[PDB]
């Protein structure tokens, strides 16, 4: 860091702004002549003769340019000279251009050619244009110019089918229909504001081309805005590494080549400069300058000058007279009218049609308003933006058809429309500037544009340009209009405000980056090329050619200002910058840094409305405003009429600004023309300044001032006071009708309770009654409902339900309405919590559930208030008290168990040498938690709880308990449960190699199927399982011996009991406790957990003493964690995500530049995007490959495996990523490289946070929400997922500390600050999941009566918490009476539900018994509502089609998620599948499971996540189908039962009901089968009996293909069937009939069922069925799995009268074409 020096900026700045001329000298063309007059002097420069054509360079006729570019040039047959000299550069290259041409030369159509080139790269063959793939931004300088640019461009690109729309003004949070526009047209200041936001990439992602029209605005006071835009754009292009083409369009002024440098233009390829010869129509010009200072006489001179120049054009010649006041237009038109008539009606009949050549047309349109009507009968007309509206557009008409001879207009016309006159006269050049608080000389931009309206391109060969101005000082205008006024940099003027925008953006983090930023500015180039202009000496430049000192000084000076005004924290030493919230707001709302200081110094929570209007007045953007003498009176009359007192402020600027704002809200008409210009200036600014004060004050939680300031923003926008009728906000309601309701002492709210007749009677306007009714019901209105529940004594969880109660109209509300959810304390003094809420039109009249947490303080208040205020509408709010009167706070939690700084335990504390051998090579001692826990877990047989921050190494704490069991028992039995499967598979691998390879005990992992799980539980010493797998086993604990005699039972992550799928965990742990006390040979419970606030309750529950319960606080974590929480106030998720991109990189460089980093992102697509962004930012930081820590050839053997191209590319650059579309191998590979240190950064999706055996030094969580398609909203990550992610920032061996940065919405910030720094409180949710467990317990006779059900509950964790946190479970009170009452009402409701669902029977009000439906639900582990639904929907006539629908409606498929835009995807799927659904909602998980079920049968391949869902669906499809069989057989329906069995075999093989049986064979296709049906092969048996040479002769093959096909036929069921009727003769009506089926196969069975498309290995299952096919009668059924051979017995009851015809059916649940049928008869 080099020494610095503070500069005087007011000395280096070009004070005079745009009017600055560094052009000390000057020259003139050939015609020099000047005429001296009395009062003034005339200067003449003649129109340049046209330059002869150069070598070739002929005009390019439209046919020459490409066929696709033909369109958009209708009306043209050839291109202009300019447009031809660069058709090649514009259309055939992508090079950056800078075009210098005179105004009117047609630079427009050059830019259009550039635009058409971009459109040309998305022609799409037959589809019109890939319109959603690109975007073009067009920066124009004036608002009026923008609007007509849109008009014209739309006319040219309609044939292309392209949307070009305006984006300028103040419309904040601009509509997402900008996604529908491809050419955004705007002003620089607007585009600067949009790109200051951060999420800019949401707009600019697709921007392939930006155009800078009238780029010579650089020299203007507005110039820095242009410098910022381009410097920002250029830098962003470097950071995305995505090409954006820049086109500069400029007027012919000096320094242009330096602008070409600025725009990264190649001088040789993309620079074009054309002098004044290339004007559209040659211009003869007069520059009259007045030498007379006397004010009144000065303007008489001027008026005399206008007069005589007009008259040199009598008949067929039009004159435009530009002036500089909305009203001066008339006082000049009538003045020349007074000048002409007075001197003998001078040259009248301007329209030389005394007999109506243009009089008949000018008197026919005469009935248009005020001054127009006056001047219309003859040649005079007028034009201004003075709200003249459609008149001025029909003045454009008549002036176009050259009827109107003389038009005097404001500058607006010159930019706004395309009408040129033969001669133009500009009068005065003086302009009032509200910002400077005075008159100044007008903008170079303005002059150039209007003077370039001289000479009609088609109707004129010459143009006359008269510029009237003051003689003194002004040949400025001559050099301006004759290629001589240079373009300079004004950057010093606005340096601190620009610096701040770049700091807030994250683009500059310190002084160093700041001087680099300056290097991208236009200022830099100019300081190098003209150091003397910019206050630098040639000697400084010589010894410092890059201007390091100057740029550092410049930056340091600015930074000091920003630090002083509290926008930026800046220290002299490091040169580092820190953004403050004040700076963030200042940048975003474009407010100068002086103002921020004032606001900060003045705003306080008790500001009055009177004082708030004062603070607005003191804003620095008003600092030059004064109170003139000639307005003193009008100001005093305004004051009396406005409502807010303006105290102590006499007529000072402060007071004037104050009443100017009030007068604007009050809609008071003005007459003072200086005053009107000042009002437009403060009122156009008032929106942003107010909104800035709003955000400042909202963020400090200031309740009263947030209300005041928000209302103030709404009042300025709606132009009405808060105390008028809300109905004024509807524009289409006649204003006198509204003032009529205000004239009553009548609350608006009451209109809701009146019909259209009572309303009409109230206003005594009967006609108006119905419309007022309509609008009353259009007004936004929300209803609120709250659901409260205490989490701890300091915090409560709040579920706010928001219910829209109004009629939606898109003409009034548009596509959405926004609201602020605020929660305030009792006194309404503090905002405890707030958040934005967006009510989309799509989901109006739809419930909305917002969940959040609020703080509370032990001497509790009676109420909090929740207000939901609209962000745009006045008087649109709804309030809801939240009573704390009956609130019961939870029991205060005990202190954490003290961490004992013991001497670290050595590995030799394990005495066993075999045991030590698997720890000694990794580490010498155990961590302080491991050593403290050691004596109790390794030298006891008793129950223990371990609560430590995730990462503390709790895994081996359980390993202690396992080793200790192995010591005690030879063939010990240990069951380990983890809530997550991905965790189970991780511990398996880790313990298999530890306990089976090293120690040779058995380690097994339970699976989906029960039989093979029972054997695994048999021979296993270590049983790994998830809770449901163990639930389905341990239900039958009475019957399965192996479940009882287990020695050690381990539960990991027991805090997950509080989460989703937590009840099943709670059930099985409780069962294990019950078994233990009921067998009197205790089972050892070891429970591992994250730090719990309520560990005592978990300890008591699992039978742990306090001395054997270890619960450590998060701040005692072996490796100290440094946690940072970073909020982003951005509601729109996709935007928020994008704006996190840079902070992600900055976190890596700040917190872990050398050590490993994991970045968690919310999705698959984001994982790839984030990694690519890190890479591209790396390269723009010039440190490309800085995350690679080996050579490329080190990686290449591993990368060769991978099949993702992009994954190779990123890894090659040091960054990996992990999503679920990668192979399990590809993921193992990436993890290996990461752990090795080779690659420094992995980006992973959150779903993978459980299945990653990888640790970093820095974990970054990039957003904490994900999309829920089911409720059309983004929802928060479970705190369990976040805790798990954070636990990854943990490397005990190498790191002194772990770091974690969590990036989230501001609405989520306070939440993380609580539940990450403190132990986590957990509750049960078993009460909302009670049915399936009661049903199972009743089926196994563990529950026989109501009392047993109450007793069962005493073993749960639910039972414990109910006393501790009653209001959480809806216990109104904590007495023992309340507990029993609740437990009883709970068992009552559950048992009554189970009975109504036909699962159980309640008898004598106390006893319960299992029924058929209950028994099948427990047997297949199916939810009770599912088999309730099955029995409800199944009938005698259901086919496979209805079966699929029924099964996909199961409640197990309720948790199949709907993801972002999966609806569009599923809608397409619906049109591709065989069966079409009726009224299908595409955000319905059951609709999706249906579609996926058909997609799987049709062998379609889909998105990766749709295939994961297809796998989840299939993982349950078989058990559900078997249930259907059971229910159908119970009802005795034959056909549906057989159908369900076909479904099982056709789900397995993944084929349809009438698909060829050959599809089961590998490698076969419809191409193959076609030649198989032709020869006569239809069955699998038919290829089986074929002899080898003939077999592969049928079609194509390979040695490996035939090998697989043959392998299939050796596992295919070759079974022979044999049957007999036992005592077939002595059988009688009503008696028993016994059918004995013998099954045997000519093969010894070994090998699972082969089914590549079914993702769960299953064994052959069979149904033996007997039926009557005539009556559709299922007589008897049996389900079996046979192995080699087996005897099957099944009986039934004989009917009457002898002979009956029966059928025996043999049915697979795994293969098609195996089904055998045998018919027979009896009696
Ligand atoms: N402007 C703004 C402020 C706060 C939030 S918040 N609290 O919802 O994140 C969003 C936008």
Short mmCIF file of C-alpha atoms in Angstrom, two decimals, residues 969-1282:
data_model
loop_
_atom_site.label_atom_id
_atom_site.label_comp_id
_atom_site.label_asym_id
_atom_site.label_seq_id
_atom_site.Cartn_x
_atom_site.Cartn_y
_atom_site.Cartn_z
CA UNK A 969 -19.75 -61.33 23.54
CA UNK A 970 -18.10 -63.50 20.88
CA UNK A 971 -20.95 -63.35 18.39
CA UNK A 972 -22.45 -60.15 19.76
CA UNK A 973 -25.44 -58.42 18.21
CA UNK A 974 -25.56 -54.67 17.59
CA UNK A 975 -28.28 -52.71 15.79
CA UNK A 976 -27.35 -49.27 14.49
CA UNK A 977 -30.05 -46.94 13.24
CA UNK A 978 -29.59 -43.77 11.19
CA UNK A 979 -32.52 -41.59 10.07
CA UNK A 980 -30.96 -41.12 6.62
CA UNK A 981 -30.23 -43.84 4.06
CA UNK A 982 -27.25 -42.00 2.59
CA UNK A 983 -25.81 -41.99 6.11
CA UNK A 984 -26.50 -45.70 6.53
CA UNK A 985 -24.60 -46.60 3.36
CA UNK A 986 -21.72 -44.38 4.53
CA UNK A 987 -21.38 -46.01 7.96
CA UNK A 988 -21.66 -49.43 6.30
CA UNK A 989 -18.58 -49.00 4.12
CA UNK A 990 -16.70 -47.42 7.03
CA UNK A 991 -17.57 -50.20 9.48
CA UNK A 992 -17.43 -53.10 7.03
CA UNK A 993 -13.73 -52.46 6.47
CA UNK A 994 -13.29 -51.82 10.19
CA UNK A 995 -15.35 -54.62 11.69
CA UNK A 996 -15.45 -57.31 8.98
CA UNK A 997 -12.13 -56.82 7.21
CA UNK A 998 -9.97 -55.81 10.18
CA UNK A 999 -11.83 -57.60 13.00
CA UNK A 1000 -13.64 -60.28 10.94
CA UNK A 1001 -17.02 -59.89 12.66
CA UNK A 1002 -20.04 -59.59 10.36
CA UNK A 1003 -21.28 -56.20 9.18
CA UNK A 1004 -24.60 -56.13 7.33
CA UNK A 1005 -26.93 -53.53 5.83
CA UNK A 1006 -30.69 -54.06 5.90
CA UNK A 1007 -32.71 -53.65 2.69
CA UNK A 1008 -36.24 -53.33 1.34
CA UNK A 1009 -37.15 -57.02 1.58
CA UNK A 1010 -38.01 -58.82 4.81
CA UNK A 1011 -36.92 -62.43 4.27
CA UNK A 1012 -33.33 -61.59 3.26
CA UNK A 1013 -33.32 -58.94 6.02
CA UNK A 1014 -34.15 -61.60 8.62
CA UNK A 1015 -31.12 -63.66 7.61
CA UNK A 1016 -28.92 -60.56 7.72
CA UNK A 1017 -30.21 -59.86 11.23
CA UNK A 1018 -29.35 -63.50 11.89
CA UNK A 1019 -25.65 -63.83 11.09
CA UNK A 1020 -24.84 -60.17 11.67
CA UNK A 1021 -22.78 -58.76 14.51
CA UNK A 1022 -23.36 -55.21 13.29
CA UNK A 1023 -26.73 -54.45 11.75
CA UNK A 1024 -27.00 -51.14 9.87
CA UNK A 1025 -30.48 -49.89 9.09
CA UNK A 1026 -32.74 -46.91 8.56
CA UNK A 1027 -35.74 -46.58 10.92
CA UNK A 1028 -38.52 -47.93 8.65
CA UNK A 1029 -36.54 -51.04 7.69
CA UNK A 1030 -36.17 -51.79 11.41
CA UNK A 1031 -39.74 -50.78 12.13
CA UNK A 1032 -41.15 -53.36 9.71
CA UNK A 1033 -38.93 -56.00 11.35
CA UNK A 1034 -39.30 -55.18 15.04
CA UNK A 1035 -43.11 -54.99 14.88
CA UNK A 1036 -43.21 -58.77 15.09
CA UNK A 1037 -40.69 -58.83 17.96
CA UNK A 1038 -42.78 -61.41 19.85
CA UNK A 1039 -42.38 -63.77 16.87
CA UNK A 1040 -38.84 -62.92 15.71
CA UNK A 1041 -36.36 -64.12 18.33
CA UNK A 1042 -33.38 -62.30 16.78
CA UNK A 1043 -35.00 -58.92 17.56
CA UNK A 1044 -35.12 -59.67 21.29
CA UNK A 1045 -31.62 -60.99 21.94
CA UNK A 1046 -29.69 -58.00 20.64
CA UNK A 1047 -27.02 -56.72 23.02
CA UNK A 1048 -26.44 -53.15 21.89
CA UNK A 1049 -28.80 -50.75 20.15
CA UNK A 1050 -27.34 -47.55 18.67
CA UNK A 1051 -29.32 -44.49 17.61
CA UNK A 1052 -27.50 -41.80 15.66
CA UNK A 1053 -28.81 -38.27 15.05
CA UNK A 1054 -31.69 -38.63 17.52
CA UNK A 1055 -32.36 -34.89 17.18
CA UNK A 1056 -33.88 -35.87 13.81
CA UNK A 1057 -36.78 -37.06 15.95
CA UNK A 1058 -38.05 -33.50 15.69
CA UNK A 1059 -38.08 -33.57 11.89
CA UNK A 1060 -39.81 -35.14 8.92
CA UNK A 1061 -40.05 -38.93 9.27
CA UNK A 1062 -39.12 -38.43 12.93
CA UNK A 1063 -42.06 -40.38 14.37
CA UNK A 1064 -40.87 -43.74 12.97
CA UNK A 1065 -37.58 -43.07 14.75
CA UNK A 1066 -39.44 -42.27 17.96
CA UNK A 1067 -41.62 -45.37 17.68
CA UNK A 1068 -38.78 -47.87 17.24
CA UNK A 1069 -36.67 -46.36 20.02
CA UNK A 1070 -39.66 -46.60 22.33
CA UNK A 1071 -40.35 -50.20 21.36
CA UNK A 1072 -36.72 -51.06 22.12
CA UNK A 1073 -37.14 -49.59 25.60
CA UNK A 1074 -40.32 -51.61 26.19
CA UNK A 1075 -38.74 -54.85 24.96
CA UNK A 1076 -35.78 -54.22 27.27
CA UNK A 1077 -37.79 -53.96 30.50
CA UNK A 1078 -40.00 -56.86 29.46
CA UNK A 1079 -37.21 -59.40 28.93
CA UNK A 1080 -35.17 -58.54 32.04
CA UNK A 1081 -31.83 -58.95 30.25
CA UNK A 1082 -31.47 -55.22 29.43
CA UNK A 1083 -30.64 -53.93 25.96
CA UNK A 1084 -27.96 -51.23 25.92
CA UNK A 1085 -29.12 -47.97 24.37
CA UNK A 1086 -26.53 -45.57 23.00
CA UNK A 1087 -27.94 -42.38 21.49
CA UNK A 1088 -25.89 -39.85 19.53
CA UNK A 1089 -27.19 -36.37 18.78
CA UNK A 1090 -26.53 -32.76 17.86
CA UNK A 1091 -26.47 -30.44 20.84
CA UNK A 1092 -29.96 -30.42 22.37
CA UNK A 1093 -31.46 -27.78 24.65
CA UNK A 1094 -33.74 -30.48 26.07
CA UNK A 1095 -31.37 -33.45 26.23
CA UNK A 1096 -32.62 -34.28 29.72
CA UNK A 1097 -35.99 -35.29 28.26
CA UNK A 1098 -34.31 -37.56 25.71
CA UNK A 1099 -32.08 -39.08 28.40
CA UNK A 1100 -35.02 -39.80 30.72
CA UNK A 1101 -36.85 -41.26 27.72
CA UNK A 1102 -34.11 -43.73 26.72
CA UNK A 1103 -33.17 -44.52 30.32
CA UNK A 1104 -29.92 -42.62 30.73
CA UNK A 1105 -28.71 -41.30 34.08
CA UNK A 1106 -27.58 -37.68 34.18
CA UNK A 1107 -24.01 -38.78 34.86
CA UNK A 1108 -24.17 -40.91 31.71
CA UNK A 1109 -25.80 -38.17 29.62
CA UNK A 1110 -23.34 -35.98 27.75
CA UNK A 1111 -24.78 -32.84 26.19
CA UNK A 1112 -22.22 -30.26 25.03
CA UNK A 1113 -22.85 -26.71 23.83
CA UNK A 1114 -22.04 -25.79 20.17
CA UNK A 1115 -19.23 -23.46 21.31
CA UNK A 1116 -17.33 -26.44 22.71
CA UNK A 1117 -17.00 -28.18 19.33
CA UNK A 1118 -13.44 -29.60 19.13
CA UNK A 1119 -12.62 -27.45 16.10
CA UNK A 1120 -13.89 -23.91 16.80
CA UNK A 1121 -16.38 -22.75 14.20
CA UNK A 1122 -16.50 -19.18 12.93
CA UNK A 1123 -19.97 -18.56 11.58
CA UNK A 1124 -21.03 -15.63 9.41
CA UNK A 1125 -24.61 -14.85 8.44
CA UNK A 1126 -25.15 -12.70 5.41
CA UNK A 1127 -28.57 -11.42 4.47
CA UNK A 1128 -29.77 -10.40 1.04
CA UNK A 1129 -32.94 -8.26 0.97
CA UNK A 1130 -34.19 -9.78 -2.28
CA UNK A 1131 -37.59 -11.47 -2.32
CA UNK A 1132 -37.34 -12.97 -5.81
CA UNK A 1133 -35.39 -16.22 -5.36
CA UNK A 1134 -33.91 -16.51 -8.86
CA UNK A 1135 -32.63 -12.94 -8.56
CA UNK A 1136 -31.36 -13.41 -4.99
CA UNK A 1137 -29.42 -16.49 -6.14
CA UNK A 1138 -27.70 -14.62 -8.96
CA UNK A 1139 -26.68 -11.76 -6.66
CA UNK A 1140 -25.02 -14.28 -4.35
CA UNK A 1141 -22.58 -15.25 -7.12
CA UNK A 1142 -19.92 -12.64 -6.39
CA UNK A 1143 -20.23 -12.91 -2.57
CA UNK A 1144 -19.56 -16.64 -2.98
CA UNK A 1145 -16.26 -15.90 -4.68
CA UNK A 1146 -15.39 -13.18 -2.22
CA UNK A 1147 -16.02 -15.56 0.66
CA UNK A 1148 -13.62 -18.09 -0.79
CA UNK A 1149 -10.88 -15.45 -1.28
CA UNK A 1150 -11.44 -13.90 2.17
CA UNK A 1151 -12.09 -16.90 4.38
CA UNK A 1152 -10.24 -19.75 2.65
CA UNK A 1153 -8.03 -18.77 -0.32
CA UNK A 1154 -5.78 -21.81 0.05
CA UNK A 1155 -7.80 -24.36 2.01
CA UNK A 1156 -10.70 -26.58 0.76
CA UNK A 1157 -14.22 -25.24 0.22
CA UNK A 1158 -17.65 -26.83 -0.11
CA UNK A 1159 -20.45 -24.69 -1.54
CA UNK A 1160 -24.00 -25.95 -1.06
CA UNK A 1161 -26.57 -24.80 -3.59
CA UNK A 1162 -30.32 -25.45 -3.73
CA UNK A 1163 -30.38 -27.50 -6.95
CA UNK A 1164 -28.80 -29.60 -9.71
CA UNK A 1165 -28.70 -26.92 -12.41
CA UNK A 1166 -27.33 -24.42 -9.86
CA UNK A 1167 -24.47 -26.73 -9.01
CA UNK A 1168 -23.03 -26.52 -12.52
CA UNK A 1169 -23.75 -22.78 -12.84
CA UNK A 1170 -22.09 -21.86 -9.54
CA UNK A 1171 -18.89 -23.79 -10.38
CA UNK A 1172 -18.63 -22.22 -13.83
CA UNK A 1173 -19.10 -18.79 -12.20
CA UNK A 1174 -16.32 -19.43 -9.70
CA UNK A 1175 -14.07 -20.45 -12.61
CA UNK A 1176 -14.90 -17.46 -14.81
CA UNK A 1177 -14.51 -15.06 -11.93
CA UNK A 1178 -11.18 -16.72 -11.15
CA UNK A 1179 -9.89 -16.00 -14.67
CA UNK A 1180 -11.12 -12.39 -14.60
CA UNK A 1181 -9.31 -12.03 -11.28
CA UNK A 1182 -6.40 -13.12 -13.54
CA UNK A 1183 -5.67 -16.04 -11.20
CA UNK A 1184 -7.03 -18.69 -13.59
CA UNK A 1185 -6.61 -22.27 -12.29
CA UNK A 1186 -5.85 -20.94 -8.77
CA UNK A 1187 -8.03 -23.72 -7.31
CA UNK A 1188 -6.00 -26.48 -9.05
CA UNK A 1189 -3.28 -27.85 -6.80
CA UNK A 1190 -1.64 -30.42 -9.10
CA UNK A 1191 -0.81 -30.65 -12.81
CA UNK A 1192 -3.36 -31.41 -15.51
CA UNK A 1193 -1.62 -34.71 -16.34
CA UNK A 1194 -2.05 -35.76 -12.72
CA UNK A 1195 -5.84 -35.59 -13.15
CA UNK A 1196 -6.17 -36.95 -16.70
CA UNK A 1197 -6.26 -40.68 -15.89
CA UNK A 1198 -9.20 -40.06 -13.48
CA UNK A 1199 -11.05 -37.56 -15.69
CA UNK A 1200 -11.00 -40.14 -18.50
CA UNK A 1201 -13.67 -42.13 -16.62
CA UNK A 1202 -16.13 -39.22 -16.40
CA UNK A 1203 -18.88 -38.78 -19.00
CA UNK A 1204 -19.92 -35.20 -18.24
CA UNK A 1205 -17.91 -32.89 -20.53
CA UNK A 1206 -18.46 -29.81 -18.38
CA UNK A 1207 -17.36 -31.75 -15.26
CA UNK A 1208 -14.03 -32.55 -16.93
CA UNK A 1209 -13.63 -28.88 -17.86
CA UNK A 1210 -14.35 -27.55 -14.37
CA UNK A 1211 -12.20 -30.17 -12.58
CA UNK A 1212 -9.37 -29.39 -14.99
CA UNK A 1213 -9.70 -25.86 -13.57
CA UNK A 1214 -9.78 -26.96 -9.94
CA UNK A 1215 -13.50 -26.93 -9.24
CA UNK A 1216 -15.74 -29.97 -8.88
CA UNK A 1217 -19.47 -30.30 -8.53
CA UNK A 1218 -21.87 -32.90 -7.10
CA UNK A 1219 -25.49 -33.30 -8.17
CA UNK A 1220 -27.72 -36.36 -8.39
CA UNK A 1221 -27.38 -36.83 -12.15
CA UNK A 1222 -23.82 -38.02 -11.63
CA UNK A 1223 -23.08 -41.73 -11.32
CA UNK A 1224 -22.41 -42.97 -7.79
CA UNK A 1225 -18.92 -43.50 -9.22
CA UNK A 1226 -18.55 -40.05 -10.73
CA UNK A 1227 -19.39 -38.72 -7.26
CA UNK A 1228 -16.90 -40.99 -5.49
CA UNK A 1229 -14.29 -39.80 -7.97
CA UNK A 1230 -14.97 -36.09 -7.38
CA UNK A 1231 -14.89 -36.62 -3.62
CA UNK A 1232 -11.52 -38.39 -3.91
CA UNK A 1233 -9.94 -35.50 -5.83
CA UNK A 1234 -11.34 -33.06 -3.25
CA UNK A 1235 -10.00 -34.94 -0.23
CA UNK A 1236 -6.62 -35.30 -1.93
CA UNK A 1237 -6.28 -31.54 -2.10
CA UNK A 1238 -5.98 -31.60 -5.89
CA UNK A 1239 -9.23 -29.69 -6.43
CA UNK A 1240 -9.97 -26.88 -4.00
CA UNK A 1241 -13.70 -26.31 -4.38
CA UNK A 1242 -16.78 -28.53 -4.70
CA UNK A 1243 -20.25 -27.17 -5.36
CA UNK A 1244 -22.96 -29.58 -4.13
CA UNK A 1245 -26.77 -29.59 -4.14
CA UNK A 1246 -28.35 -29.69 -0.68
CA UNK A 1247 -29.87 -33.17 -1.17
CA UNK A 1248 -26.30 -34.43 -1.14
CA UNK A 1249 -25.39 -32.96 2.26
CA UNK A 1250 -26.17 -36.28 3.90
CA UNK A 1251 -24.23 -38.48 1.44
CA UNK A 1252 -20.81 -36.80 1.35
CA UNK A 1253 -17.78 -38.26 3.10
CA UNK A 1254 -15.84 -35.04 2.63
CA UNK A 1255 -14.83 -32.08 4.79
CA UNK A 1256 -13.77 -28.50 4.08
CA UNK A 1257 -12.18 -25.60 5.92
CA UNK A 1258 -14.90 -23.34 4.62
CA UNK A 1259 -18.53 -24.25 4.02
CA UNK A 1260 -20.71 -21.74 2.20
CA UNK A 1261 -24.46 -22.23 2.06
CA UNK A 1262 -25.74 -20.32 -0.93
CA UNK A 1263 -29.39 -19.59 -0.12
CA UNK A 1264 -31.60 -21.57 2.24
CA UNK A 1265 -34.81 -22.06 0.30
CA UNK A 1266 -36.18 -24.35 -2.39
CA UNK A 1267 -39.24 -24.43 -4.62
CA UNK A 1268 -42.36 -26.35 -3.62
CA UNK A 1269 -44.49 -26.77 -6.73
CA UNK A 1270 -47.35 -28.08 -4.61
CA UNK A 1271 -47.98 -24.72 -2.94
CA UNK A 1272 -46.41 -22.49 -5.61
CA UNK A 1273 -43.91 -21.03 -3.16
CA UNK A 1274 -40.34 -21.24 -1.90
CA UNK A 1275 -39.85 -22.92 1.47
CA UNK A 1276 -37.03 -22.93 4.02
CA UNK A 1277 -34.39 -25.64 4.46
CA UNK A 1278 -35.03 -27.82 7.51
CA UNK A 1279 -32.74 -26.68 10.36
CA UNK A 1280 -31.48 -30.28 10.33
CA UNK A 1281 -30.13 -29.89 6.78
CA UNK A 1282 -28.44 -26.60 7.65
#
